[PDB]
């Protein structure tokens, strides 16, 4: 098996490089954030523009959905994160505390908490209801590239340019594990596997790795793409065959066989670094977005 993703649509609208694309949990929406300071909502199946949500003062590096597809959180260079009511498009709260760019964000499964990572080298945990910061973790010694809750919310994983990936206990904020990748190259992205037993990390040495964090063992490696400059999102595609999906600095989307580590398909079309990709929660659909010379978003569909 090799998926056969083909272009569905090209979503244009952003005036600057797109930074992140995410599918809502119920699967009917695609939310995008851009260096143009805007967030746009699109129809996941028709690729139809739905609305623009604005408010941030500077570019936005990331956006995440709440478990009920009703809320959206964004991380911006203006040093804040913003919680948005998706249907009205208005800003419910502005999370303040970070002393530099906020680079990444995510709701926990319960969606009562928000975790953020910033260039200030800290990871903060916020209360969604009040917009207050509950904890500030002295997580790394360099910018934090990614933050992610595991499936039960008890854990948080963070990656950093300091070359480390750390597992944190959500309730206490204490570090449970620090992982080293021998040469310790900058970690540009990390995320738990759907079942929560693994961690997929991207390092700026053109390499992706699946780790059993508990054992500190590398089970698989995915290479062949180009990644030594930007923090490119990576995904687990489990709707059909089990694949590993990721953007690449050579303008293509890479799809690997998760078990054999074999490249099963490269999607062509974008005209600049594919900085972000997302996998639809129920259908074999992929959303990809590129930088400045492209600024478009593409929806791909496969029989898988």
């Amino acid at each position: 098996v090799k998926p056969n993703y083909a272009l569905m649509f090209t979503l244009a609208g952003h005036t600057k490089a797109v930074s992140s694309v995410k599918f809502s949990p119920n699967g009917e929406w695609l939310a995008s954030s851009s260096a143009d300071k805007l967030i746009k909502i699109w129809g996941a199946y028709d690729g139809k523009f739905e609305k623009t949500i604005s408010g941030h003062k500077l570019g936005i590096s990331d956006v995440a959905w709440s478990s009920d597809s009703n809320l959206l959180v964004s991380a911006s260079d203006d040093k804040t994160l913003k919680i948005w009511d998706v249907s009205s498009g208005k800003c419910l709260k502005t999370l303040k505390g970070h002393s530099n760019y906020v680079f990444c964000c995510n709701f926990n499964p319960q969606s009562n908490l928000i975790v953020s990572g910033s260039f200030d080298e800290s990871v903060r945990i916020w209360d969604v209801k009040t917009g207050m910061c509950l904890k500030t973790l002295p997580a790394h010694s360099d910018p934090v590239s990614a933050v992610h809750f595991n499936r039960d919310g008890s854990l948080i994983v963070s990656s950093s340019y300091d070359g480390l990936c750390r597992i944190w206990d959500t309730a206490s904020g204490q570090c449970l594990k620090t992982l080293i990748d021998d040469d310790n190259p900058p970690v540009s992205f990390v995320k738990f596997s759907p079942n929560g037993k693994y961690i997929l990390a991207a390092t700026l040495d053109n390499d992706l790795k699946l780790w059993d964090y508990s054992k500190g063992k590398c089970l698989k490696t995915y290479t062949g793409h180009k990644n030594e400059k930007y923090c490119i999102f990576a995904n687990f595609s489990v709707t059909g065959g089990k694949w590993i999906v990721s953007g690449s600095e050579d303008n293509m989307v890479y799809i690997w066989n998760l078990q054999t580590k074999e490249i099963v398909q490269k999607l062509q079309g974008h005209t600049d670094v594919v900085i972000s990709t997302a996998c639809h929660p129920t259908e074999n659909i992929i959303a990809s977005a590129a930088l400045e010379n492209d600024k478009t978003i593409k929806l791909w569909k496969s029989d898988c």
Binding site: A17, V18, S20, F103, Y230, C231
Partner: peptide, 5 residues
Amino acid sequence: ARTKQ
């Protein structure tokens, strides 16, 4: 700013 290196 993820869009910048």
